[PDB]
C-alpha cells in the first residue's frame, strides 16, 4: 500500500475496525482499534496479568529500542471498559511512517471485554488535550513534528460487512475513489478534546425528527448514539421499540425504510436503510441508532461507514462526502 496507507479489517457486522501497526525493533505487528474518541496508544504486554491469550503482547525485552518510563497510566472508557499499566517509549511504524520515540502505554491489567476482543490495543486519534497522562504527544502530534506527513490530516474509509467489509486510513492524504461528488468542509469544535461538529437538522422523509444538535465523530463507537429526545423522535419515525437498555428493536426488513438524513453545513449526509439495522439475532434486529444520557450525540460507525471523512487536526476541521458504492 502507499505511504501512510493502512488497510483496515472490519470485525463482525461493522462492530469495529482495526489496522496493523508495527512497534519496536525489529518490531512486532499489532492489531489496533483506530479510535478518534480517545488519545492514548496502549497495547497488551507481557507484564499483563489478565490479558487474553489470543492477543499479541508487546515484550519490552524483545525490542532494542525500548526505553523505560517511571510513570503509570489508567483509563476508563464510556462503555465501562478499562485498562491500566506503565508508560514506555519505542518506535511505531504506521503505514510505513516510522514515528521515533513515541510514548506507548503497556497494559498490566485490562477489562475482560478487551481480553476477549479482536484487537491488541487502541490507537487514539483524538486531540492531545485528553491524553490520560499530561505531556504525552499523540501519534498525529509526532507525525507532524517529525515531518512524516506534509498535511496534518488523515482520510478515513470504513467499509460495510455487506459489501466485503474492509476499510482504509491514509495519514497525510486521502483517496477520492472512496467518495462521490465534492467534499464539504465542516468546522470542528475541539474544546473537549474530541472531533465535535454541529448537525443542522435530521430528517426522515418529509419529517424533521431533530433540529440542530452537537455531536462527536467517534470511530471507536459502533452505533449512532443520540440524546434521549432526539433518539425517541427518530425511533417513532421508524416504529422501533425501546429495549430499555439504550438500544431499540427495529424491523429486520429495511426495504420500506427511508434513509436518515443529516444536514451538515448546508450538505446532506445519510445513514442508508441497511445501516439502520446493526445486528440480527434469532429473528430480531437491533437498530443502528441508540440513546445515551448525554446532551450531545456520539456519531459512530453507523454514520461513518456511509460517509468518507478527512480529519484535519491543524485547522481543525473535517471534510465529508458520501461514500462511493
Coordinates of N, CA and C in Angstrom, one line a residue, residues 145-318:
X145 N 5.3 16.8 13.9 CA 6.5 17.4 14.3 C 7.8 16.7 13.7
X146 N 7.7 15.4 13.4 CA 8.8 14.7 12.8 C 8.8 14.8 11.2
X147 N 7.8 15.5 10.7 CA 7.7 15.7 9.3 C 7.3 14.5 8.4
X148 N 6.7 13.5 9.1 CA 6.2 12.3 8.4 C 5.0 12.6 7.5
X149 N 4.3 13.6 7.7 CA 3.1 14.0 6.9 C 3.3 15.5 6.6
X150 N 3.0 15.9 5.4 CA 3.1 17.3 5.0 C 1.8 18.1 5.3
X151 N 0.7 17.4 5.4 CA -0.6 18.0 5.8 C -1.1 17.3 7.0
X152 N -1.5 18.0 8.0 CA -2.0 17.4 9.3 C -3.4 16.8 9.2
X153 N -3.5 15.8 8.3 CA -4.8 15.2 8.0 C -4.7 13.7 7.8
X154 N -5.8 13.0 8.0 CA -5.9 11.6 7.7 C -7.3 11.3 7.1
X155 N -7.3 10.5 6.0 CA -8.5 10.2 5.4 C -9.0 8.9 5.9
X156 N -10.3 8.8 6.1 CA -10.9 7.5 6.6 C -12.1 6.9 5.9
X157 N -11.9 5.7 5.4 CA -12.9 4.9 4.7 C -13.2 3.7 5.5
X158 N -14.4 3.5 5.9 CA -14.8 2.3 6.7 C -15.8 1.6 5.8
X159 N -15.5 0.3 5.5 CA -16.3 -0.5 4.6 C -17.5 -1.1 5.3
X160 N -18.4 -1.7 4.6 CA -19.6 -2.3 5.1 C -19.4 -3.8 5.0
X161 N -19.7 -4.6 6.0 CA -19.6 -6.0 6.0 C -20.4 -6.6 4.9
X162 N -21.5 -6.0 4.5 CA -22.3 -6.5 3.4 C -21.7 -6.3 2.1
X163 N -20.7 -5.4 2.0 CA -20.1 -5.1 0.7 C -18.6 -5.7 0.7
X164 N -18.3 -6.6 1.6 CA -17.0 -7.1 1.7 C -16.2 -6.6 2.9
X165 N -16.7 -5.6 3.6 CA -16.0 -5.0 4.7 C -14.8 -4.2 4.4
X166 N -13.8 -4.4 5.2 CA -12.5 -3.7 4.9 C -12.6 -2.2 5.4
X167 N -11.7 -1.4 4.9 CA -11.6 0.0 5.3 C -10.2 0.4 5.1
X168 N -9.9 1.7 5.2 CA -8.6 2.2 5.0 C -8.3 3.6 5.5
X169 N -7.2 3.8 6.2 CA -6.9 5.1 6.8 C -5.6 5.5 6.0
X170 N -5.6 6.8 5.6 CA -4.5 7.4 4.9 C -4.0 8.6 5.7
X171 N -2.8 8.4 6.3 CA -2.2 9.5 7.0 C -1.4 10.5 6.1
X172 N -1.9 11.7 6.1 CA -1.2 12.7 5.3 C -1.9 12.9 3.9
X173 N -3.0 12.3 3.7 CA -3.7 12.4 2.5 C -5.1 11.7 2.5
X174 N -5.7 11.7 1.3 CA -7.0 11.0 1.2 C -7.2 10.4 -0.2
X175 N -8.1 9.5 -0.4 CA -8.4 8.8 -1.6 C -9.8 9.1 -2.2
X176 N -9.8 9.9 -3.3 CA -11.1 10.2 -3.9 C -11.9 9.1 -4.6
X177 N -11.3 7.9 -4.7 CA -12.0 6.8 -5.3 C -13.0 6.3 -4.3
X178 N -12.8 6.7 -3.0 CA -13.7 6.2 -2.0 C -15.0 7.0 -1.7
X179 N -15.1 8.2 -2.4 CA -16.3 9.0 -2.2 C -16.8 9.6 -3.5
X180 N -18.0 10.1 -3.5 CA -18.6 10.7 -4.7 C -18.9 12.2 -4.5
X181 N -18.7 12.9 -5.6 CA -19.0 14.4 -5.5 C -17.9 15.2 -4.9
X182 N -18.2 16.4 -4.4 CA -17.3 17.3 -3.8 C -17.3 17.1 -2.3
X183 N -16.2 17.3 -1.6 CA -16.1 17.2 -0.2 C -16.7 18.5 0.4
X184 N -17.3 18.4 1.6 CA -17.9 19.6 2.2 C -17.1 19.8 3.5
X185 N -16.7 21.1 3.6 CA -15.8 21.4 4.8 C -16.7 21.8 6.0
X186 N -16.4 21.2 7.1 CA -17.2 21.4 8.3 C -16.2 21.8 9.5
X187 N -16.5 22.9 10.1 CA -15.6 23.3 11.3 C -15.7 22.4 12.4
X188 N -14.6 22.2 13.2 CA -14.6 21.3 14.3 C -14.4 22.1 15.6
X189 N -15.1 21.6 16.6 CA -15.0 22.2 18.0 C -14.3 21.2 18.8
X190 N -13.0 21.5 19.1 CA -12.2 20.5 19.8 C -12.0 21.0 21.3
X191 N -12.9 21.8 21.8 CA -12.8 22.3 23.1 C -12.8 21.2 24.2
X192 N -13.4 20.0 23.9 CA -13.4 18.9 24.8 C -12.5 17.8 24.5
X193 N -11.6 18.0 23.5 CA -10.7 17.0 23.1 C -11.2 16.0 22.0
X194 N -12.4 16.2 21.6 CA -13.0 15.4 20.6 C -13.2 16.1 19.2
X195 N -13.6 15.4 18.2 CA -13.9 16.0 16.9 C -15.3 16.3 16.9
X196 N -15.7 17.4 17.5 CA -17.1 17.9 17.6 C -17.6 18.7 16.5
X197 N -18.8 18.4 16.0 CA -19.4 19.1 14.9 C -20.8 19.5 15.3
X198 N -21.5 20.3 14.4 CA -22.8 20.6 14.7 C -23.7 20.1 13.5
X199 N -24.7 19.4 13.8 CA -25.6 18.9 12.8 C -26.8 19.9 12.8
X200 N -27.1 20.5 11.6 CA -28.1 21.5 11.5 C -29.5 20.9 11.7
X201 N -29.8 19.7 11.2 CA -31.1 19.1 11.4 C -31.0 17.6 10.9
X202 N -32.0 16.9 11.2 CA -32.1 15.5 10.8 C -33.6 15.2 10.3
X203 N -33.7 14.6 9.2 CA -35.0 14.3 8.6 C -35.1 12.8 8.1
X204 N -36.3 12.4 8.2 CA -36.7 11.0 7.7 C -37.9 11.3 6.8
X205 N -37.7 11.2 5.5 CA -38.8 11.6 4.6 C -39.0 13.1 4.7
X206 N -40.2 13.5 4.8 CA -40.5 14.9 4.9 C -40.6 15.4 6.4
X207 N -40.4 14.5 7.3 CA -40.4 14.8 8.7 C -39.1 15.2 9.4
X208 N -39.1 16.4 10.0 CA -37.9 16.9 10.7 C -37.9 16.2 12.1
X209 N -37.1 15.2 12.3 CA -37.1 14.5 13.5 C -36.2 15.2 14.6
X210 N -35.4 16.1 14.1 CA -34.5 16.8 15.0 C -34.0 18.1 14.4
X211 N -33.8 19.1 15.3 CA -33.2 20.3 14.9 C -31.7 20.2 15.2
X212 N -31.0 21.4 15.2 CA -29.6 21.4 15.4 C -29.1 20.7 16.7
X213 N -28.1 19.9 16.7 CA -27.6 19.3 17.9 C -26.1 19.1 17.7
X214 N -25.3 19.0 18.7 CA -23.9 18.8 18.7 C -23.6 17.3 18.8
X215 N -22.5 16.9 18.2 CA -22.1 15.5 18.2 C -20.6 15.4 18.0
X216 N -20.0 14.2 18.3 CA -18.6 14.0 18.0 C -18.4 12.8 17.1
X217 N -17.4 13.0 16.2 CA -17.1 11.9 15.2 C -16.3 10.9 16.0
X218 N -16.8 9.7 16.3 CA -16.1 8.7 17.0 C -16.0 7.4 16.3
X219 N -14.9 7.1 15.7 CA -14.7 5.8 15.0 C -14.6 4.6 16.0
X220 N -14.4 5.0 17.3 CA -14.4 3.9 18.3 C -15.7 3.5 18.8
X221 N -16.8 4.1 18.4 CA -18.2 3.7 18.8 C -18.9 3.1 17.6
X222 N -19.6 2.0 17.9 CA -20.3 1.3 16.8 C -21.6 1.9 16.3
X223 N -22.4 2.3 17.2 CA -23.7 2.9 16.9 C -23.7 4.4 16.8
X224 N -24.9 4.9 16.4 CA -25.1 6.4 16.3 C -25.9 6.6 17.6
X225 N -25.3 7.1 18.6 CA -26.0 7.4 19.9 C -26.5 8.8 20.0
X226 N -27.8 9.0 20.2 CA -28.4 10.3 20.2 C -29.0 10.6 21.5
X227 N -29.1 11.9 21.8 CA -29.7 12.3 23.1 C -31.1 11.8 23.2
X228 N -31.6 11.5 24.4 CA -32.9 10.9 24.7 C -34.1 11.4 23.8
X229 N -34.4 12.7 23.8 CA -35.5 13.2 23.0 C -35.3 13.0 21.5
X230 N -34.1 13.2 21.0 CA -33.8 13.0 19.6 C -33.9 11.6 19.2
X231 N -33.4 10.7 20.0 CA -33.5 9.2 19.7 C -34.9 8.8 19.7
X232 N -35.7 9.3 20.6 CA -37.1 8.9 20.6 C -37.9 9.4 19.4
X233 N -37.5 10.6 18.9 CA -38.1 11.2 17.7 C -37.8 10.3 16.5
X234 N -36.5 9.9 16.4 CA -36.1 9.1 15.3 C -36.8 7.7 15.4
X235 N -36.8 7.1 16.6 CA -37.4 5.8 16.8 C -38.9 5.8 16.3
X236 N -39.6 6.9 16.6 CA -41.0 7.0 16.2 C -41.2 7.0 14.7
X237 N -40.2 7.6 14.0 CA -40.3 7.6 12.6 C -40.1 6.3 11.9
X238 N -39.4 5.4 12.6 CA -39.2 4.0 12.1 C -40.0 2.9 12.8
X239 N -40.8 3.3 13.8 CA -41.6 2.4 14.5 C -40.8 1.4 15.3
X240 N -39.6 1.8 15.8 CA -38.8 1.0 16.6 C -39.2 1.1 18.0
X241 N -39.0 0.0 18.8 CA -39.4 0.0 20.2 C -38.2 0.0 21.1
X242 N -38.3 0.8 22.2 CA -37.2 0.9 23.2 C -37.0 -0.4 24.0
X243 N -35.8 -0.9 24.0 CA -35.4 -2.1 24.7 C -35.1 -1.8 26.2
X244 N -35.0 -0.5 26.5 CA -34.8 -0.1 27.9 C -33.3 -0.2 28.3
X245 N -32.4 -0.5 27.4 CA -31.0 -0.6 27.7 C -30.2 0.3 26.8
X246 N -30.8 1.3 26.1 CA -30.1 2.2 25.3 C -30.2 1.8 23.8
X247 N -30.8 0.7 23.6 CA -30.9 0.2 22.2 C -32.4 0.0 21.8
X248 N -32.7 -0.1 20.5 CA -34.0 -0.3 20.0 C -34.2 -1.5 19.2
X249 N -35.4 -2.1 19.2 CA -35.6 -3.2 18.4 C -36.3 -2.7 17.1
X250 N -35.8 -3.0 16.0 CA -36.4 -2.5 14.7 C -36.7 -3.6 13.8
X251 N -37.5 -3.3 12.8 CA -37.9 -4.3 11.8 C -36.7 -4.7 11.0
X252 N -36.5 -6.0 10.8 CA -35.4 -6.6 10.1 C -35.5 -6.2 8.6
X253 N -36.7 -5.9 8.2 CA -36.9 -5.6 6.8 C -36.8 -4.1 6.6
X254 N -35.7 -3.7 6.1 CA -35.4 -2.2 5.8 C -35.8 -1.7 4.5
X255 N -36.4 -2.6 3.6 CA -36.8 -2.2 2.3 C -37.8 -1.1 2.3
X256 N -38.6 -1.0 3.4 CA -39.6 0.1 3.4 C -39.1 1.4 4.1
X257 N -37.9 1.3 4.7 CA -37.4 2.5 5.5 C -36.7 3.5 4.6
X258 N -36.9 4.8 4.9 CA -36.3 5.9 4.2 C -35.0 6.1 5.0
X259 N -34.0 6.6 4.3 CA -32.7 6.9 4.9 C -32.8 8.1 6.0
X260 N -31.9 8.0 7.0 CA -31.9 9.0 8.0 C -30.9 10.1 7.5
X261 N -31.4 11.2 7.1 CA -30.6 12.3 6.6 C -30.2 13.4 7.5
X262 N -28.9 13.6 7.6 CA -28.3 14.7 8.4 C -27.9 15.9 7.5
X263 N -28.3 17.1 7.9 CA -27.9 18.3 7.2 C -26.8 18.9 7.9
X264 N -25.6 18.9 7.3 CA -24.4 19.4 8.0 C -23.8 20.5 7.1
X265 N -23.7 21.7 7.7 CA -23.1 22.9 7.0 C -23.6 23.0 5.6
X266 N -24.9 22.8 5.4 CA -25.5 23.0 4.0 C -25.5 21.8 3.1
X267 N -25.0 20.7 3.5 CA -25.0 19.5 2.7 C -25.8 18.3 3.4
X268 N -26.2 17.4 2.6 CA -26.9 16.2 3.1 C -26.1 15.0 3.2
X269 N -26.1 14.3 4.3 CA -25.3 13.1 4.5 C -26.3 12.1 5.2
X270 N -26.3 10.9 4.8 CA -27.2 9.9 5.3 C -26.7 8.6 5.8
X271 N -27.6 8.0 6.6 CA -27.4 6.6 7.1 C -28.4 5.8 6.2
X272 N -27.8 5.0 5.4 CA -28.6 4.2 4.5 C -29.6 3.3 5.2
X273 N -30.7 2.9 4.6 CA -31.7 2.0 5.2 C -31.0 0.7 5.8
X274 N -30.1 0.1 5.0 CA -29.4 -1.1 5.5 C -28.7 -0.8 6.8
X275 N -28.1 0.4 6.9 CA -27.3 0.7 8.1 C -28.2 0.9 9.4
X276 N -29.5 1.1 9.2 CA -30.5 1.2 10.3 C -30.6 0.0 11.1
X277 N -30.1 -1.1 10.5 CA -30.1 -2.4 11.2 C -28.7 -2.8 11.5
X278 N -28.3 -2.8 12.8 CA -27.0 -3.1 13.2 C -26.7 -4.6 13.2
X279 N -27.5 -5.4 14.0 CA -27.4 -6.8 14.1 C -28.7 -7.5 14.2
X280 N -28.7 -8.8 13.7 CA -29.9 -9.6 13.7 C -29.6 -10.8 14.6
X281 N -30.4 -11.1 15.6 CA -30.1 -12.2 16.5 C -31.4 -13.0 16.7
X282 N -31.5 -14.3 16.2 CA -32.6 -15.1 16.3 C -33.9 -14.4 15.8
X283 N -33.8 -13.9 14.6 CA -35.0 -13.2 14.1 C -35.3 -11.8 14.5
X284 N -34.5 -11.3 15.5 CA -34.7 -9.9 16.0 C -33.6 -9.0 15.6
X285 N -34.0 -7.8 15.1 CA -33.0 -6.8 14.7 C -32.8 -5.6 15.6
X286 N -31.6 -5.3 15.9 CA -31.3 -4.2 16.8 C -30.9 -3.0 15.9
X287 N -31.5 -1.8 16.2 CA -31.3 -0.6 15.4 C -29.9 -0.1 15.4
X288 N -29.5 0.6 14.4 CA -28.1 1.2 14.3 C -28.0 2.4 15.1
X289 N -29.1 2.9 15.7 CA -29.1 4.1 16.5 C -29.6 3.7 17.9
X290 N -29.0 4.4 18.9 CA -29.4 4.2 20.3 C -29.5 5.5 21.0
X291 N -29.6 5.4 22.3 CA -29.6 6.6 23.1 C -28.8 6.5 24.4
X292 N -28.3 7.7 24.8 CA -27.5 7.8 26.0 C -28.0 9.0 26.8
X293 N -27.5 9.1 28.0 CA -28.0 10.3 28.8 C -27.0 11.5 28.6
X294 N -26.7 11.7 27.4 CA -25.8 12.8 27.0 C -26.6 13.9 26.3
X295 N -26.0 15.1 26.4 CA -26.7 16.3 25.7 C -26.2 16.4 24.3
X296 N -25.2 15.6 23.9 CA -24.6 15.6 22.6 C -24.7 14.2 22.0
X297 N -24.5 14.1 20.7 CA -24.6 12.8 20.1 C -23.2 12.2 19.8
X298 N -23.1 10.9 19.8 CA -21.9 10.2 19.5 C -22.1 9.6 18.1
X299 N -21.5 10.2 17.2 CA -21.7 9.8 15.8 C -20.6 8.7 15.4
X300 N -21.0 7.5 15.7 CA -20.2 6.4 15.4 C -20.2 5.7 14.1
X301 N -19.7 4.5 14.0 CA -19.6 3.7 12.8 C -20.8 3.6 11.9
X302 N -22.0 3.6 12.5 CA -23.2 3.6 11.7 C -23.3 4.7 10.7
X303 N -22.8 5.8 11.1 CA -22.7 7.0 10.2 C -21.5 7.0 9.3
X304 N -20.3 6.8 9.9 CA -19.1 6.8 9.3 C -18.9 5.8 8.1
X305 N -19.6 4.7 8.2 CA -19.4 3.7 7.2 C -20.3 4.0 5.9
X306 N -21.0 5.2 6.0 CA -21.8 5.7 4.9 C -21.2 7.0 4.4
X307 N -20.2 7.5 5.1 CA -19.6 8.8 4.7 C -18.1 8.9 4.9
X308 N -17.4 9.2 3.9 CA -15.9 9.3 3.9 C -15.6 10.6 4.6
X309 N -14.6 10.6 5.5 CA -14.2 11.8 6.3 C -12.7 12.0 6.3
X310 N -12.4 13.3 6.1 CA -11.0 13.7 6.1 C -10.8 14.5 7.4
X311 N -10.0 14.0 8.3 CA -9.8 14.7 9.6 C -8.6 15.6 9.5
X312 N -8.8 16.9 9.8 CA -7.7 17.9 9.7 C -7.5 18.4 11.1
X313 N -6.4 17.9 11.8 CA -6.1 18.3 13.1 C -5.5 19.7 13.2
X314 N -5.0 20.2 12.1 CA -4.4 21.5 12.1 C -5.3 22.7 12.2
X315 N -6.4 22.7 11.5 CA -7.3 23.9 11.5 C -8.0 24.2 12.8
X316 N -8.8 23.2 13.4 CA -9.1 21.9 12.9 C -10.5 21.9 12.2
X317 N -10.7 20.9 11.3 CA -11.9 20.8 10.5 C -12.0 19.4 9.9
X318 N -13.1 19.1 9.3 CA -13.2 17.8 8.6 C -13.9 18.1 7.3

